[PDB]
UniProtKB/Swiss-Prot annotation:
GO cellular component, one term: protein-containing complex
Quaternary organization: Homodimer.
GO BP, one annotated term: protein stabilization
Protein name: Heat shock protein 90 homolog
Family to which the UniProt record says this protein belongs: Belongs to the heat shock protein 90 family.
Primary localization: cytoplasm
Boundaries of the shown chain within the full protein: 3 to 218 of 707
Chaperone as UniProt keyword: yes
Length: 216
C-alpha cells in the first residue's frame, strides 16, 4: 500500500499548465515532437554514461522510443529507454523547483510567440496539456526503484512507488489521458503523419505498437 506523496507545483508552473490546458492554439500536434525530443534527450544521457561504463545499459540493453495507443482507455503512452528519473528527480524536475523557462515563455506568449516555441524554453513537457487533461509519468533510473508521478493540471502532483505498472527496466513512460476531441492521436495513420513531419531527425528507433484483429 505505497504511500501517495502529495507535492505542490511552484506557482509559475501551475500558471503555465493552466494556460496550456485552456489555450485554443491550432497546432496541437507539436506535443508529440516535444515528448519525442525529451525522450531523445534522456536516451542521449544514458548513451553518454554507457560510453564510459557499458554496464549502465544492462537494465535495458536496447535504446528506443515506443508509442503505444491504448484505444479502450483513451490513453496514449510514450515510452523510452533513456536514463530515467529517480523519485527525487521526479519531485525536483517536474514541479517543485521553479524553472526559469516558465516565466520567460509566458512572457513570450504574451508578446505573440507561437506555442510551438515552448521547447526553446526547456518546458516542452507541459505541451501535453494541449491534448490531454491528465498524465502519469512512470520512470525507472538505475539508481532508484520505479515510481509514478501523477498530475491533473492543477496545483498539486503526487509521487508513488510503482506497484501497478509494467516494469520499464530503465527509462520513462508518459501515459496521456487524451481529451475527448483529441482521440485522433490514438490512430496509427495520424501518429505516423506527425512523427514523419516533426521528428525526422532522431537518432533512435521510433516504434509504433498497433493492435489489429486477426480476421477469418
Ligand atoms: C521539466 C520539463 O523539462 C522538459 O520538458 N524537458 C527536459 C527533460 C528531458 C528529459 C528528461 N528526462 C530525464 S534526464 N530522464 N528521463 C527524462 C524524461 C523526461 C520527460 C518529461 C517528464 C520531462 C519525458 O517526457 C521523457 C523522459 O525520458 C528530463 C527533462
Amino acid at each position: 500500500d505505497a504511500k501517495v506523496e502529495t507535492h505542490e507545483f511552484t506557482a509559475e508552473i501551475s500558471q503555465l499548465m493552466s494556460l496550456i490546458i485552456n489555450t485554443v492554439y491550432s497546432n496541437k500536434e507539436i506535443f508529440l515532437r516535444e515528448l519525442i525530443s525529451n525522450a531523445s534527450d534522456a536516451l542521449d544521457k544514458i548513451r553518454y554514461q554507457a560510453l564510459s561504463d557499458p554496464s549502465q545499459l544492462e537494465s535495458e540493453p536496447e535504446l528506443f522510443i515506443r508509442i503505444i495507443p491504448q484505444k479502450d482507455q483513451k490513453v496514449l503512452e510514450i515510452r523510452d529507454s533513456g536514463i530515467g528519473m529517480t523519485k527525487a528527480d521526479l519531485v525536483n524536475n517536474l514541479g517543485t523547483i521553479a524553472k526559469s523557462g516558465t516565466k520567460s515563455f509566458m512572457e513570450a506568449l504574451s508578446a505573440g510567440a507561437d506555442v510551438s516555441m515552448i521547447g526553446q524554453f526547456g518546458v516542452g513537457f507541459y505541451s501535453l496539456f494541449l491534448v490531454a487533461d491528465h498524465v502519469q509519468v512512470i520512470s525507472k533510473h538505475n539508481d532508484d526503484e520505479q515510481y509514478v508521478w501523477e498530475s491533473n493540471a492543477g496545483g498539486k502532483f503526487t509521487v508513488t512507488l510503482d506497484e501497478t505498472n509494467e516494469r520499464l527496466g530503465r527509462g520513462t513512460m508518459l501515459r496521456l489521458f487524451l481529451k475527448e476531441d483529441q482521440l485522433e492521436y490514438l490512430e496509427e495513420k495520424r501518429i505516423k503523419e506527425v512523427v514523419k513531419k516533426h521528428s525526422e531527425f532522431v537518432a533512435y528507433p521510433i516504434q509504433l505498437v498497433v493492435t489489429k484483429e486477426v480476421e477469418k
